[PDB]
Design a protein around this ligand. Structure first.
Ligand SMILES: Cn1c(-c2c[nH]c3cc(C#N)ccc23)nc2ccc(C(=O)N3CCO[C@@H](c4ccccc4)[C@@H]3CO)cc21
Ligand SMILES: [Mg+2]
Length: 449
């Protein structure tokens, strides 16, 4: 019979933010599920019930719960719901019949939420899922809780941020609203904690028709979500840069240059950055396949040469996947590259070459110097161009994030505008009560050329 193996409500609920249940189904179809939301009739009206003998069971359903008109999986509370607990009544189905109906109450009440978030204005451009000819693509470093909880992040990096707004539950509510509100097709995320993927992103995004894949780095990792109605996952080709550089003959030539600089070599091989690669097939035209890559490069401000080497590994691996394993399919390469447009790594991506005398070959000092020349054959451009910044914190700001696209195979139809400098600095810098990351999500609508 159709039955829920998992059924969970969020730990924290805010007015104007979606309540996304976590559910797992056995012997049933997800499109057959029935939902009905209830809210307390008054703040504190519903007292949790103890078990009573069946002969003294209630003669009528409790007057402490009010039936809402919401029959959707996701419920967004209004400000009129502040102080109420919620209750979801749901039934699993297989298309022919229904399993036993289930009920679940929230532990928390609906809290007041921020009156405005930076993505509200941006959401005015993404009210609908794009037409079959487009690919709405997102790239976003969502700031891992493993880092945000440290004393260094709380008191050194983000001391201006309201401490409650840096907490996982608050930021996950904002991130869930932000991402679902973009109505996107391809979502590439960085700094995804394992529990954030399983308990926050998967429940929210699967309710809006997206499926995700996760790749760990060390303490957090990368996620790629894709809209099931527009794409199917064909194959995965994830790598760790240090493993691929040392073991794979694809990077043979690069390693020959690097071994001439033992100090620079050791530094690169001790980095744990990974590359997530997913080959997707269009559900509308099976002849249209896309290679979606996602990364998070070395963070250090003076790590220029390391990012150059990691990018050189990434592009050689992407070449192999998109041009050897597949017959020259278009590339979408998202990430937090930790590289501004005036750097060597960015010059290398856009120009297809970098000379050996670039200042970035000595970015971390003389001991770790590794002058070399590099080339790649891809014709790539930044889909959202070069914003003034994509990362804005008290101590630094810069354009670090990109959606790189094969400029011969894809073109940009729309760039969802980033918040203004005034809006970004409302609470001095990021994150804030109104913005759930130190980075700003890149969103664009792409089309096949
Ligand atoms: C991008 N960036 C620069 C920076 C400043 N100027 C730049 C210019 C370029 C360029 N081009 C690249 C980077 C920077 N300085 C930074 C300092 C900190 C972090 C940070 O928040 N993290 C890195 C260390 O690991 C994590 C962490 C661990 C423990 C505690 C807190 C965080 C976290 C992951 O993203 C990022 C910075
Ligand atoms: Mg960070």
């Amino acid at each position: 019979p159709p039955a829920f193996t998992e059924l969970q409500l969020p730990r924290y609920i805010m007015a104007g933010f979606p309540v996304c249940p976590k559910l797992s189904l056995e012997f049933g179809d997800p499109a057959s599920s029935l939902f009905r939301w209830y809210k307390e009739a008054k703040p504190g009206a519903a007292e949790p019930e103890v078990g009573v003998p069946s002969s003294l069971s209630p003669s009528s359903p409790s007057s402490s719960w009010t039936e809402t008109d919401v029959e959707e999986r996701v419920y967004t509370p209004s400000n009129a719901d502040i102080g109420l607990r919620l209750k979801l009544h749901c039934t699993p189905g297989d298309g022919q019949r229904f399993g036993h109906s289930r009920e679940l109450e929230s532990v928390c009440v609906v809290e007041a939420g921020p009156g405005t978030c930076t993505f509200d204005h941006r959401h005015l451009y993404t009210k609908k899922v794009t037409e079959d000819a487009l690919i709405r693509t997102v790239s976003y470093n969502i700031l891992a809780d493993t880092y945000a909880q440290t004393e260094f992040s709380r008191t050194v990096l983000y001391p201006y941020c309201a401490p409650y707004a840096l907490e996982l539950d608050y930021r996950q509510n904002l991130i869930q609203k932000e991402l679902t509100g973009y109505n996107a097709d391809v979502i590439c995320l960085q700094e995804v904690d394992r529990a954030v993927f399983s308990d926050s992103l998967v429940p929210a995004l699967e309710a809006f028709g997206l499926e995700g894949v996760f790749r760990i780095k060390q303490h957090e990792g990368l996620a790629t979500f894709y809209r099931k109605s527009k794409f199917s996952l064909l194959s995965q080709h994830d790598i760790s840069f240090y493993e691929a550089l040392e073991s794979d003959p694809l990077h043979k030539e690069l390693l020959e240059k690097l071994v001439l600089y033992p100090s620079a070599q050791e530094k690169v091989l001790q980095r744990s950055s990974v590359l997530q690669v997913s080959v997707l097939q269009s559900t509308k035209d099976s002849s249209k396949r896309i290679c979606v890559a996602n990364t998070h490069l070395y963070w250090h401000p003076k790590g220029g040469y390391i990012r150059l080497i990691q990018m050189a590994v990434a592009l050689a691996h992407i070449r192999h996947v998109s041009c050897d394993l597949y017959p020259g399919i278009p590339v979408i390469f998202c990430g937090d590259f930790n590289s501004t447009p005036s750097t060597g790594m960015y010059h290398f991506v856009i120009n297809g070459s970098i000379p050996e005398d670039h200042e970035d070959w000595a970015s971390n000092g003389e001991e770790e110097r590794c002058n070399m020349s590099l080339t790649h054959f891809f014709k790539l451009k930044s889909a959202c161009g070069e914003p003034a910044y994509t990362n804005y914190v008290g101590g630094f700001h810069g354009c670090l994030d990109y959606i790189f696209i094969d400029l011969n195979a894809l073109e940009v139809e729309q760039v969802i505008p980033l918040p203004s400098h005034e809006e970004v600095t409302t609470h001095q810098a990021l994150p804030s009560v109104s913005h759930p990351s130190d980075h700003i999500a890149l969103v664009c609508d792409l089309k096949w050329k």
